[PDB]
Amino acid sequence: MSWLNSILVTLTSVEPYKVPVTVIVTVTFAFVCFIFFYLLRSIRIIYGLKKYTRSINSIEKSAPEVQLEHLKSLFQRSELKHAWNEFEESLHSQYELENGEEKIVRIRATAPSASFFSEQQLVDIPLNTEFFKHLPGILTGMGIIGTFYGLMIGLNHFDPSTPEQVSSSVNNLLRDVLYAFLGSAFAIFASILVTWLEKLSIAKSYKYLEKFTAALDSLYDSGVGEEYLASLVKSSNESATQARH
Amino acid sequence: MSWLNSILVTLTSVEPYKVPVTVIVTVTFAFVCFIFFYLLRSIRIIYGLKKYTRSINSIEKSAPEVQLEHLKSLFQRSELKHAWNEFEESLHSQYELENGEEKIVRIRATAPSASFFSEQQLVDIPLNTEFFKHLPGILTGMGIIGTFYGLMIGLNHFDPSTPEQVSSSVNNLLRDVLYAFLGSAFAIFASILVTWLEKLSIAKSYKYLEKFTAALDSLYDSGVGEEYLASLVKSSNESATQARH
Amino acid sequence: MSWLNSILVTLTSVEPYKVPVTVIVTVTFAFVCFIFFYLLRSIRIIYGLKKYTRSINSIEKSAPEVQLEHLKSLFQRSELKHAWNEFEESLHSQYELENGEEKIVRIRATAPSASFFSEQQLVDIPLNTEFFKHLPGILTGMGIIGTFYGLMIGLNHFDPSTPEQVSSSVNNLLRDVLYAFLGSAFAIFASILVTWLEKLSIAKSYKYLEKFTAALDSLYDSGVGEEYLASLVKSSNESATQARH
Amino acid sequence: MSWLNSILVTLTSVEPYKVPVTVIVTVTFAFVCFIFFYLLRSIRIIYGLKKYTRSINSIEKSAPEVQLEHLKSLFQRSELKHAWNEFEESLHSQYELENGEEKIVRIRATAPSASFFSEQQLVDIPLNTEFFKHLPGILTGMGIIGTFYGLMIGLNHFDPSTPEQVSSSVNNLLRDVLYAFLGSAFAIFASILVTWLEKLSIAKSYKYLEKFTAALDSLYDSGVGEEYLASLVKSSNESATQARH
Amino acid sequence: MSWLNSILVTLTSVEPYKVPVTVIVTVTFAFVCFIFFYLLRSIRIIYGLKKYTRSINSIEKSAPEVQLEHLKSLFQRSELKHAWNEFEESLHSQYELENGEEKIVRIRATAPSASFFSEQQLVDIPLNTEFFKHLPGILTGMGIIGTFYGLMIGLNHFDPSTPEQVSSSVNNLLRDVLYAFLGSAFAIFASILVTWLEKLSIAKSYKYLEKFTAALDSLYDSGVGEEYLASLVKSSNESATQARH
Amino acid sequence: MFGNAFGVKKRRSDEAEKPFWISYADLMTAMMVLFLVVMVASLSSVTQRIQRAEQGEKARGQDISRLCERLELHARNVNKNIVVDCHDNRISFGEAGRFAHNQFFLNAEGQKALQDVVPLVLEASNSEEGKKWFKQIVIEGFTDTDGSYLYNLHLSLQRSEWVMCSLLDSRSPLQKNISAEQQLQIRKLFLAGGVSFNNAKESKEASRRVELRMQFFGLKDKRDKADEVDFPPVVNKEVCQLVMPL
Amino acid sequence: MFGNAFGVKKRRSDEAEKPFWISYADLMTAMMVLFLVVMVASLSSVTQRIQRAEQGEKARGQDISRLCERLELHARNVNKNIVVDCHDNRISFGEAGRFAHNQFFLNAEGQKALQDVVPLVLEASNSEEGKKWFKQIVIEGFTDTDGSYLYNLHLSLQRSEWVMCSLLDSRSPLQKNISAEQQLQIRKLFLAGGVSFNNAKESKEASRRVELRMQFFGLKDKRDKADEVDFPPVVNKEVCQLVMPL
Ligand SMILES: CCCCCCCCCCCCCCCCCC(=O)OC[C@H](COP(=O)([O-])OCC(O)COP(=O)([O-])OC[C@@H](COC(=O)CCCCCCCCCCCCCCCCC)OC(=O)CCCCCCCCCCCCCCCCC)OC(=O)CCCCCCCCCCCCCCCCC
Ligand SMILES: CCCCCCCCCCCCCCCCCC(=O)OC[C@H](COP(=O)([O-])OCC(O)COP(=O)([O-])OC[C@@H](COC(=O)CCCCCCCCCCCCCCCCC)OC(=O)CCCCCCCCCCCCCCCCC)OC(=O)CCCCCCCCCCCCCCCCC
Ligand SMILES: CCCCCCCC/C=C\CCCCCCCC(=O)OC[C@H](COP(=O)(O)OCCN)OC(=O)CCCCCCC/C=C\CCCCCCCC
Ligand SMILES: CCCCCCCC/C=C\CCCCCCCC(=O)OC[C@H](COP(=O)(O)OCCN)OC(=O)CCCCCCC/C=C\CCCCCCCC
Ligand SMILES: [Ca+2]
Ligand SMILES: [Ca+2]
Ligand SMILES: [Ca+2]
Ligand SMILES: [Ca+2]
Ligand SMILES: [Ca+2]
């Protein structure tokens, strides 16, 4: 086809230096996007999680109402605001009669706080980890495309007619592939760096999210339903005995 | 063997340009199918999720019966119609005897909204993610098939058997290799482009489905079984007390 | 030792054509095994799921008992017979005293139908997806082994002891490389085709299984435990006043 | 550097035939370790699962106490013993006065049998699949390493001083490339054979574990808690009526 | 661009032997980091898990209060303190009034210990398994960068201007190829060794974590809620009979 | 027991593809193609250099053979006693080149043939083959192995000097026949060599002889002004040094 | 309400590397190696004749250099006047070899150096290196382009004849230190004759000199036995025929 020859001569007419610069610029823009949307975002997330954990650890000995109010005032970021609202829906306040009034004496947990302050909600959705975990593969592919493009440029211009032409064509082909591999090696180095930074950041985000949910779990005791069932069984036995008495 | 030699002469008889053309055409067809069946479909899903989230936020402060009717009328697409029916089954309606009749005073949640408006049913199955997450690998493998078959053509033509016609053999080999690498580079470019598009779309779909389920989860409060158990325990204690009195 | 040289004489003694033929035959046999044990099985599973959904979407207006015997007689298949038995165990039948006897008035779902008609029990284990998802790698490995063995044959044949024998030796070695690449190219083409069909079959099977379980989920309503607890709380509250009166 | 040359002389000093021998022996040792630690254990696990399924299917029509004793004596492997203890304590035995002592009349299932006889517990951990699924890549990597090492030996010992020295060095290079091809072919063959055997074994293990847990799941019925709550509600209503009467 | 030309001329003038030295230094640093941050930590984790398991197995036949005190002492001076605290919250202590004092007669499990002593928080996060499963690929990327760069240098230097210069060009090219192969062989050997080591250690870690959480589960029995419900049902029936009598 | 059976599932993020073995495979695909291309290009180039050198040497030999053939044909056309041997690039004299004891001059036929062959050599060097390959001509003296060695050497060297004079003596017909440019060219071409003693077959008649041979540029030889010694234009006539009473 | 808390979920089990990519990297590396080694073998095969010829040329150069270094070492040890140019195989007697205008003799040092170096060069030629690569010795003559041509030619010819006389004249000091076999070897290894023109030196006094320039067999010559001739034993002493009193 003449279309294939036309697109080939169009593609391979670009200067061989424009392949490495294109690969480097594209990989660098992808790296800057990664830094801004994932690395900095995850650093802010970890800082906020540490600060929230410090705040929660400071109301361990407070009254249930006071610490509930403190936690309600603490959580204002939208994702953690909704997470706290659902978690507080999960908490079961136990009332007792003092001075002829119903007041909270103890707050019990029915679900772990990780059910609401989950890894997805607080880390995965904010960091777009469903996308950013595939970025190293994209960078590697861009480097590979750069190398193949440089090789194609070198091969299109090869002239095997005369030995001097053969030598010059070999030199030009190697030079074009060397440019392209400069771009590709930059792409692979950036892929390695992105892999390391991403995996470290996600591991630390999960670590401090676990610490945050651990701080939230320590405030409230679980196992209230079994206690209620035991109380019902005891009440039934006592009711039978008291009926006879 | 006559069969294998016939197979080779049949394969290598094709014009070398038809190899990159076939790879490019089929890979472009795969890309078009990806756009039609995954990308535009995911865009429609995201827009629908955003519109449904907007609709749910408008009934935050309405009566539970009015909220229920509005949500029943809102969800009419098949998979969300089924999801809403199941979710409404999960909701617990608390009745009180008011003005001689039973009226719904509060609707309580028993399961998260994500349990029925799941990522699978609403995103992964309509988008056929079980197939499309493997499409980039298929595209790269198609490029690899083009690479082998093009180098097979090139090696087939290389048989000069005469010093005069060595230049023609080298030229034909370079042309066939150029075709093979053009096909492979296009296939790799399309594979990384598909990876970009599908992972970005799936991340956005999960993000907005999370927002939708969070909007649904804020309508109804959970923890009603524990309240019922607490009521039963208190009832047993006051029952013994009332019996003695 | 001399053992290595002896075996290398043994292996590299076969004709170069016998290797692509062996690769093609074994890869075609594995492809036929894939088509028989996997593709036709997945097609039969999909059509069975479609047929089962139609019947369930047909008893949606029948009396709960009649529905129950219709579903019991419908499911005659070891995996689905067991899944139906377990699902029926998960259903809670409600009895009310009518005409002096206990008759089923309503059947309630306590677990989703996918907990028993799950993907592993109905698709993954019947299709041996734990094996067949790794078949393309096996096919490509067979092709690579064939290519390597053909390369050993070609390299054993290559021996330009004279300056005038260099062109003939190079051409013959390139022909042997052509044979080996033929084996590899066929194996990789078959692997890509198998991957495409296998992923598409999984996507279709999962979609139709979701439709089937959604049909089953629609027959029965959940929330029976919360209703029972609300009834118990109401009964205790009424019983206090009953005792007083 | 002097260090690099010393390393090259030390590494290259080994005989060329010791690299294919090393690759073949190391790959064969890895294959034998795979056979002993994965394949034989998987075969033993599958045979035990089939025998246990036959024993469970034989004990279907016995009294609950006899079934419990038979199943307790059946499972003696440490993982099976732990799984059976957990499953048995998850089973709910219903006692009825017949007629002066507590007798077990029915045993109910409050959890799936696969929750304790799970794939992780019974197949994945004993088979060390977390290591053995990466073995074929290790085998192919050792093939690649042998290729590189053999060529290093061939290249370092190249002696261009004299024309017959050149001829002998070229012959050594050709033998080294043939050796590298042989080692790579053997490594890839053993890798794909390990992959085939491993995936077939793991699929059969999952199939027979599913059959075994289905056999256990058939012995006992679920939904005991909902039945208890229904009994409690009916008892409350009947107690109100009985108090009035 | 002048900068690109300067970069190309400086990268072409690099001594061929420096590339393998850089590969070796970087891969050795990565291996030392792997040993320090993953292998030694995994060994420590495994030893600690075995020590914990032996400590738990020493209180199989002890009184429940003594068991609880021993476990609290065992996990209190550790990083598993909060996991143990949550697990003990999930434990239901049954009380009986003996000698006028409320004493713990039995402890019942309401959740598996794997839900608190999870794999992520005990193995994956400490070992950074998210990153270290990518380290073999990182080493492979370093190897390919070094190899391609060295082979490009070798081909750039290879240019026989006259047939009398063929011997020297061949010798120098073989030396450069030897350097590139050295780099790649070291990098791929370290990749395979890292894969083997960290897969084996992660398998051992999972095995011993399972032994630990199984020792935790062996202490306490489950199913107390169904027993409480059965007691409530019996008490209701007996209360009706008691009222009549 | 207090949990909900309708809980979230599929909590499984897909693992990303490992990209580095893909990069290794594709970069070795490019490198393999590069090595194949360099293989075929280098083999073709080296073979082309080898065949180019072979055919250049053959063309130089063919040009030398053509020059010798045309020079021998011209020699036959001019006068028949000339003996030209293309196999060793030597022009000899069949019988006119003989010499007797205590004799240092050719006979009348010898002098005539010596005068006749000069314009033929000038024409041969003039032609394209001469410009491409023709070196200067040396004169070799031959004498029997008998008698006094110094006597034989002096006699043969005197023969060579007399031949050179007859080439360039003013009284010789060549000087009055040739021009200044032809004289300068003769000065550039004709040189005096050594004395050889190739005595064989016990034939003193043919042993004591003088013949002229032409040399040729090699394929690798270079033409430059340093070797091109330019004689100044003739300002005075030349009289020979060996006088007749000797 | 009645969910199972003991329902377990499979871990995050990351899949292994796809075997196709590592196998493809292995295959591509193997192909790259195959093409490299086939290029190496093919290039070493096509040029093996050229390699062997170049090795033989280098060996000939080494042998010639060793022989020349041995000869110049002998010259340095014995007589300071004899200076040897191993770069272009020249024996020079610069100070002792100056020739004044219109005379063909030399001072005492010229003869001392010549009759001293001849036995040393004979000993060098008699060695295995000499018996393998040493041909006869050419006496070099130099003339200028000024004045009458034939006078300069006669002067150079007389200088060469005087050199040969001095090598092989009766009563010469060399003749008292020689044997018959050595005299025969000198007769065989020496030819007197040869003239040249050059402008590579800044002074005309330099052209008034004599030099010894030995030349060697080519690689493909290899000492053709038929070229060698023979001389009879000396029956009477040689007598120089140049005018010594002048
Ligand atoms: C020649 C150039 C090559 C071009 C490219 C290759 C060929 C074309 C690719 C085919 C895909 C496009 C077809 C779309 C047309 C209409 C379909 C439609 O409307 O619904 C689509 C459907 C819509 O689904 P939905 O909207 O959710 O459902 C409602 C619809 O109404 C849908 O429900 P429904 O009510 O309509 O039900 C119908 C359903 C019924 O489904 C069932 O009941 C069960 C289905 C079981 C699935 C098993 C697969 C089919 C088995 C056939 C086996 C044939 C063997 C092939 C060759 C073997 C020997 C060579 O059937 C299907 O829709 C099946 C899926 C269609 C794909 C199968 C193509 C069959 C034609 C054969 C083509 C021949 C060329 C082969 C080339 C290679 C060799 C030379 O789309 C999807 O499900 C999404 C995936 C789309 C696939 C895109 C493919 C990517 C591109 C890959 C390129 C090549 C791959 C590399 C391998 C080759 C070797 C190297
Ligand atoms: C002889 C050298 C020759 C070779 C040179 C090249 C090396 C190539 C090797 C390839 C990779 C092998 C590395 C294996 C070990 C790493 C595994 C790991 O996760 O370690 C655990 C460990 C942290 O986890 P852990 O065990 O729990 O540690 C306790 C925590 O510190 C405390 O516990 P926590 O969790 O509560 O802590 C809070 C947490 C949470 O805080 C956060 O917010 C962190 C989350 C995001 C992290 C943001 C950090 C961004 C840093 C920017 C770049 C810095 C350097 C990059 C170097 C590459 C550039 C050439 O904070 C952190 O984790 C921050 C620590 C991470 C920063 C590490 C220090 C920076 C460089 C190390 C200095 C030593 C020099 C060695 C050689 C330098 C290379 C030339 O991380 C390290 O300390 C790793 C450092 C070891 C050397 C790393 C070398 C960088 C590799 C990048 C690839 C190079 C590509 C070339 C780029 C060119 C592009 C054109
Ligand atoms: C962390 C990397 C992970 C794996 C990478 C694999 C290998 C890739 C790398 C690298 C090149 C080898 C490193 C050499 C360092 C030596 C520096 C030194 O001591 O001297 C300082 C030097 C003086 O020496 P020269 O004058 O250049 O000597 C010339 C002799 N012919 O001056 C300087 O200031 C530094 C000059 C830098 C030289 C090397 C540049 C390498 C940079 C990046 C490498 C990236 C991969 C290569 C891709 C190439 C594609 C075109
Ligand atoms: C089910 C297989 C799974 C995957 C398969 C991929 C491998 C693809 C390859 C290859 C083709 C094998 C060649 C044919 C097999 C034997 C048929 C046969 O009868 O051949 C005859 C011939 C006898 O000929 P003669 O009578 O002596 O004289 C003839 C002179 N012209 O027999 C042979 O040479 C024997 C061939 C060897 C068979 C082994 C094949 C192994 C394949 C792959 C594994 C890698 C090998 C590594 C060995 C390492 C040893 C420590
Ligand atoms: Ca707590
Ligand atoms: Ca809510
Ligand atoms: Ca339902
Ligand atoms: Ca059951
Ligand atoms: Ca237990």
CB burial readout G82-100, b (16+ within 10 A) else e:
bbbeeeebebbbeebbbbe
Distance CA B145, CA A72 (A): 60
Residues with Cβ < 8 Å from E213, sequence gap 6 or more? E112, E113, E114, E117
Distance F17 CA to ligand 2 centre (A): 23
- C192 CB near ligand 4 (under 6 Å): no
Cα D52 to Cα C124: distance, rounded to the nearest angstrom: 23
Ligand nearest, relative to CA of residue D218: 8
User: Count of alpha carbons within 13 Å of G19, Cβ hemisphere only?
Assistant: 35
**What contacts E12, CB < 8 A, 6 or more positions away?**
A178, E153, E156
DSSP state of F182: H
Q: How many CB pairs under 8 A join E and G?
A: 41
Q: Does D185 contact ligand 4 (Cβ within 6 A)?
A: yes
Give residue for tokens 């041997």: F85
What are the residues facing F191 on neighbouring strands?
F138
Contact flag for A and C (3+ C-beta pairs < 8 Å): no
Task: Determine the Cα–Cα distance for residues C110 and C93; give it in Å rounded to an integer.
Answer: 10
CA distance F2 to E229: 12
Q: Is C114 exposed, middle or buried (0-12, 13-18, 19+ CB in 10 A)?
A: buried
In the block, tokens 């006979």 appear at: F107
For residue B32, with 0-12 CB atoms within 10 Å meaning exposed, 13-18 middle and 19 or more buried, which class applies? exposed
Q: For residue F212, what are the β-bridge partners?
A: F91, F139
Q: Residue C126, Cα to own-chain centre: how many angstroms?
A: 6
Ligand 4 atom closest to residue D182's alpha carbon, by position in its atom list: 47
For G12, phi and psi rounded to 5 degrees? -75, 85
DSSP assignment of chain D equals -HHHHHHHHHHHTS-TTHHHHHHHHHHHHHHHHHIIIIIHHHHHHHHHHHHHHHHHHHTTTS-HHHHHHHHHHH--SHHHHHHHHHHHHHEEEEEEE-SSSEEEEEEEESS-GGGTS-HIIIIIHHHTHHHHTTHHHHHHHHHHHHHHHHHHHHHHT---SSHHHHHHHHHHHHHHHHHHHHHHHHHHHHHHHHHHHHHHHHHHHHHHHHHHHHHHHTTSB--HHHHHHHHHHHHHHHHHHHHH-
Q: Which ligand is nearest to the CA of E13?
A: 3
- Alpha-carbon span B189 to A11, nearest angstrom: 14
CA–CA separation, A61 and D67 (whole Å): 52
Tokens of E28: 């050795």
Experimental method of this PDB entry? cryo-EM
Distance CA G197, CA G143 (A): 6
User: What distance in Å separates the CA atoms of residue G188 and residue G170, rounded to the nearest whole number?
Assistant: 18
Report the C-alpha gap between G161 and G104 in whole angstroms. 9
Neighbour order of strands in the sheet with G211-216:
G83-85, G90-92, G211-216, G134-140, G190-191
d(Cα F57, Cα A220) in Å, to the nearest integer? 101
* Residue among A191, A180, A145, A146 at smallest CA distance from A30: A191
Burial label, A213 (beta-carbon count in 10 A; 0-12, 13-18, 19+): buried
Cα A147 to Cα A19, A180, G33: the distances in Å are: 8, 5, 20
Of F10, F33, F44, the CB nearest to B166: F44
Cα(C208) to ligand 1 centroid in Å equals 16
Among C4, C8, C13, C14, residue to substitute to test ligand 4 (most atoms within 8 Å of Cβ): C14
Max CA distance (Å), chain A: 120
The type of residue at A233 is V
Residue A79 has, within 13 A of its CA and on its CB side, a CA count of 18
Mutate to test the interface with C, among F6, F35, F51, F54 (most CBs of C within 10 A): F6
What does the alpha-carbon distance between residue A3 and residue B18 come to, in Å, rounded to a whole number?
A: 12
CA distance A9 to D236: 89
Q: What is the rounded CA–CA span in Å between residue E96 and residue C61?
A: 52
Is E92–A17 a contact, with Cβ atoms under 8 angstroms apart?
Answer: no
Task: Give bridge partners of residue E97 from the DSSP assignment.
Answer: E102
Span from the CA of C196 to the centroid of ligand 1 (angstroms): 9
| Side-chain half-sphere CA neighbours of F21 within 13 A | 26
Q: Which secondary-structure segment (H or E) carries A192?
A: helix A163-217
- If DSSP codes are grouped into helix, strand and coil, which group holds residue C24? helix
**Residues F211/F140, Cβ–Cβ less than 8 Å:** yes
Return the SS3 of E91: strand
Q: Which atom of ligand 2 is nearest to the CA of E29?
A: 1
Judged by its nearest atom, the ligand closest to the C-alpha of residue E116 is 5
Structural domain contains residue F133? yes
Distance (Å, whole) CA F159 – CA B43: 111
CB atoms within 10 A of CB F210: 23
Kind of pairing between the strands at E91-98 and E101-109: antiparallel
Q: Torsions phi, psi of G136, nearest 5?
A: -75, 165
Alpha-carbon gap: E102 to the closest alpha carbon of chain A (Å): 13
Question: Which of F8, F29, F33 faces B112 most closely, judged by CB atoms?
Answer: F8
**Can chain G be said to touch chain A, i.e. do they have 3 or more Cβ pairs within 8 angstroms?**
no
Q: In terms of DSSP bridges, do strands F134-142 and F190-196 run parallel, antiparallel, or are they unpaired? A: parallel
Integer Cα distance of D10 and E182 in angstroms:
12
Interacting residues of G34 by C-beta distance below 8 A, sequence separation 6+: C151, C155, C177, D177, D181
Q: CB–CB of F236/F169 below 8 Å?
A: no
Count of alpha carbons within 13 angstroms of residue A154, beta-carbon side = 31
Give the closest residue to E236 by CA, choosing from F129, A130, D239, F163: D239
Closest CA to F72 of F62, F82, F64: F82
d(C-alpha G24, C-alpha D143), whole Å: 12
Q: What is the resolution of this structure in A?
A: 2.6
Residue from C210, C65, C224, C59 nearest B89 by CA: C224
Helix, strand, coil in percent for chain B, rounding step 5: 75, 5, 15
Residue ID of nearest Cα to ligand 2 atom 61: A204
Ramachandran quadrant class, D170 (left: phi over 0; alpha: psi -120 to 50; beta: rest)? alpha
The alpha carbon of residue E24 is apart from the nearest alpha carbon of chain G, in Å, by 20
Contacts of G242 (CB under 8 A, 6+ apart): F154, G104, G158, G161, G162, G165
**Distance of alpha carbon C41 from alpha carbon C43, whole angstroms:** 5
Rounded Cα distance between C85 and F129, Å, is 108
Q: Is residue G36 included in any domain, yes or no?
A: no
Beta-carbon-side half-sphere exposure of residue A236 (alpha carbons within 13 Å): 24
CB contact set of E67 (below 8 Å; sequence gap of 6+): E59, E107, E219
Give residue ranges of E with CB < 8 Å to any G CB. Answer: 110-112, 114-115, 119-120, 124, 133, 136-137, 151, 160, 163-164, 166-167, 170, 173-174, 177, 206, 222
Interface of C with B in 18-77 (CB under 8 A): 18, 20-21
Residue B78's Cβ-count burial label (10 Å; 0-12, 13-18, 19+) is exposed
In angstroms, the CA A161 to CA B170 distance is: 9
For β-strands A101-108 and A92-98, DSSP reports them as antiparallel
Residue C145 Cβ inside 6 Å of ligand 4? The answer reads: yes
For the CA atoms of chain C, what is the radius of gyration?
Answer: 32
- In degrees and rounded to multiples of 5, residue B221 shows phi and psi of -95, 145
Q: What is the DSSP letter of G227?
A: G
Pocket of ligand 3 (CB under 6 A): A 178, 181-182, 185; E 10-11, 13-15, 18-19, 22-23, 26, 142, 145-146, 149
CB distance C226 to D233 below 8 Å: no
What does the DSSP 8-state code read for residue G158? H
Is residue F20 a part of any domain in this protein? no
Give CA–CA dist B111/C110, Å, rounded. Answer: 12
What is the phi-psi region of residue C128: left when phi exceeds 0, alpha when psi lies from -120 to 50, beta otherwise? left
- Residue G147: which region, alpha, beta or left (left: phi > 0; alpha: psi -120 to 50)? left
| Cβ atoms of residues B212 and B56 within 8 Å | yes
Residue B158 gets the label, from left (phi > 0), alpha (psi -120 to 50) or beta, of: beta
Beta bridge partners of B94: B106
Residue G143 is part of a domain; what is its CATH number?
Answer: 3.30.1330.60
E34 CA to centre of ligand 2 in angstroms: 12
Tokens of G158: 């007389």
Q: How far apart are CA F76 and CA C151, in angstroms?
A: 67
Length of chain B: 245
| In contact, C213 and C113? CB cutoff 8 Å | yes
How far is B151 from C123, CA to CA, in rounded Å? 41
Q: Cβ contacts (< 8 Å) between E228 and chain F: which residues? A: none
Whether residue D5 is preceded by a cis peptide bond, meaning omega within 30 degrees of 0, is no
If you write DSSP's letter for every residue of B140-198 in order, what string do you get? HHHHHHHHHHHHHHHHHH----SGGGHHHHHHHHHHHHHHHHHHHHHHHHHHHHHHHHH
Q: Count the domains in chain F.
A: 1
**What is the span of the domain harbouring residue G184?**
62-227
From the list A122, A134, A117, the residue with the least C-alpha distance to A198 is: A134
For residue B50, what are its two tokens?
């955003």
Name every protein residue with a CB atom under 6 angstroms from any ligand 2 atom. A 43, 46, 189-190, 192-193, 196, 200-201, 204, 207; E 25-26, 29-30, 33, 37, 128, 131, 138
Contact B94, C230 (CB under 8 A): yes
Q: How far apart are CA C150 and CA C171, in angstroms?
A: 15
Residue pair C179/C143 in contact (Cβ under 8 Å)? The answer is no
Task: Please enumerate in sequence order all residues whose Cβ is within 8 A of that of C129, keeping only pairs 6 or more positions apart, or say none.
Answer: C123, C202, D203
**Number of the ligand closest to the Cα of C114:** 7
* Residue C16, ligand 4, Cβ within 6 A: no
Instruction: Give the mutation candidate from F148, F152, F160, F184 for the G interface (greatest G CB count, under 10 A).
Output: F148
Using only C-alpha atoms, chain G has a radius of gyration, in whole angstroms, of: 35
Query: Does some domain include residue F32?
Result: no
Strands G90-92 vs F190-196: parallel, antiparallel or unpaired: unpaired
Q: How many CB atoms lie within 10 A of CB G124?
A: 18
Which two structure tokens, joined as six digits, stand for C202? Answer: 């999984």
A177 in E contact zone (CB under 8 Å): yes
Specify the residue for token string 């060579």.
Answer: F160
Within 8 A of F6 by CB-CB distance, chain C residues are 111-112, 222
Report d(CA F243, CA G4) in Å as an integer: 140
* D contact residues 190-219, partner E, Cβ 8 Å cutoff: none
Please give the single-letter amino acid code of residue C179.
Y
**Secondary structure class of F106 (helix, strand, coil):** coil
Query: Does residue G235 form part of some domain?
Result: no
The two structure tokens encoding residue G197 = 């023109």
Measured in residues, chain G has a length of: 246
Contact C110 CB / ligand 4 (< 6 Å):
no
